Amino acid sequence: IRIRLKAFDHRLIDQATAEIVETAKRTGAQVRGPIPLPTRKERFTVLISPHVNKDARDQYEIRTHLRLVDIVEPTEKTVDALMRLDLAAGVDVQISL
């Protein structure tokens, strides 16, 4: 089983990882290493004056962070627990068999 973790904060994500790679160890299973992935950086430019003045801008950004964790030898026990976990708000997870 693979779970991909994704979020806007980096401290926040490096929690959920540690949380999951604690349970996986708990409910007897081998977890194949939290491996980080390229972080997408959507960028935006906007006129900051409400009229005229083209050369006056802000440059905004959203950094998305991706993490991947595997499940080597999925115990029957684990599959329920790693499914049943209330996980920090503002974090998307995608467990997929």
Binding site: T45, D55, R57, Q59
Partner: protein, 127 residues
């Protein structure tokens, strides 16, 4: 017992392995004279060897990914000068005096708002 460097210039990265031998070179499963058309490139790649006359006393092996020609060519030179002063912690001082040991750093400047390029700014004629 093969000696290794990484080497970077602009956007290039060059991982290199040297071994004692008669003076062969491979870049990305290819020969020097093939991979690099431009003459400059060649000069640059071998000038660390040409310095410490091991031009034909060691046999080199390389791969490069990223950058253009003068980038890769440059990145390789740095790669060698790293390995070549690791096989021999001795040579450093000589290598260094030629200014091969430093990693260039010069990158392309970003484009900025209000400008046509990094620093070129649109005309306005007082004419």
């Amino acid at each position: 017992n093969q000696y290794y460097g990484t080497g970077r210039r602009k956007s290039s990265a060059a991982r290199v392995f040297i071994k004692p031998g008669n003076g062969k070179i491979v870049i990305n499963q290819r020969s020097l004279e093939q991979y690099f058309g431009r003459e400059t490139a060649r000069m640059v790649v071998r000038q660390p060897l040409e310095l410490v006359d091991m031009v034909e006393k060691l046999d080199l092996y390389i791969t490069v990914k990223g950058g253009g020609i003068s980038g890769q060519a440059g990145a390789i030179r740095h790669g060698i000068t790293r390995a070549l002063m690791e096989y021999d912690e001795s040579l450093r001082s000589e290598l260094r005096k030629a200014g091969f040991v430093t990693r260039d750093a010069r990158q392309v400047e970003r484009k900025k708002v209000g400008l046509r390029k990094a620093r070129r700014r649109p005309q306005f004629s007082k004419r």
